Amino acid sequence: MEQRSAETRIVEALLERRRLKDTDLVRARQESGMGLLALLGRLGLVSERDHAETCAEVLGLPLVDARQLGDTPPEMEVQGLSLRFLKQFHLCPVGERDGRLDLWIADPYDDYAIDAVRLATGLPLLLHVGLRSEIDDLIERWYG
């Protein structure tokens, strides 16, 4: 159906909301490997909060914060996700309710990562956007 990419719509919304300066965006254009929004985050040009916010607006997804998560994992399995994978992709299973896996995710526009999670777990997902470092903190607190 194919109108514009989720990343493109997020970048456009960052500009329009003035969470990103057009001068900064023009300077950003690879090469660590690095997606555009990744590079903006790494150059210090978009805050984690405004990244999360905008991802949530564009994709219509709920936002979840660190107040909402307890000190140890809730219960449930969950297969196919190594601790390393969680850390690399910055996402974290946080619960299972009505036959769906609640997944806290930094980069909900990344269809490669999501399709990886869908295939590895074999579970239907419910995506919740979280600030990158908050997800990282929970992964470590809950594991390693």
Where along the sequence are the contacts to ligand CAC (CB under 6 A)? Answer: 73-76, 78, 93-96, 101
Kindly state the smallest distance separating residue 59's Cβ from ligand CAC, in Å. Answer: 21
**Residue with the closest Cβ to ligand CAC?**
76
Question: Considering beta carbons, is residue 75 or 98 the nearer one to ligand CAC?
Answer: 75
- Sequence-distant contacts of 115-121: CB under 8 A, at least 24 apart: 116/85, 116/89, 117/81, 117/89, 117/91, 119/80, 120/79, 120/80, 120/81, 120/85, 121/78, 121/79, 121/80, 121/81, 121/93
Tokens of 56: 């949530």
Question: Considering beta carbons, is residue 49 or 100 the nearer one to ligand CAC?
Answer: 100
Kindly state the smallest distance separating residue 14's Cβ from ligand CAC, in Å. Answer: 30
Question: Considering beta carbons, is residue 12 or 102 the nearer one to ligand CAC?
Answer: 102
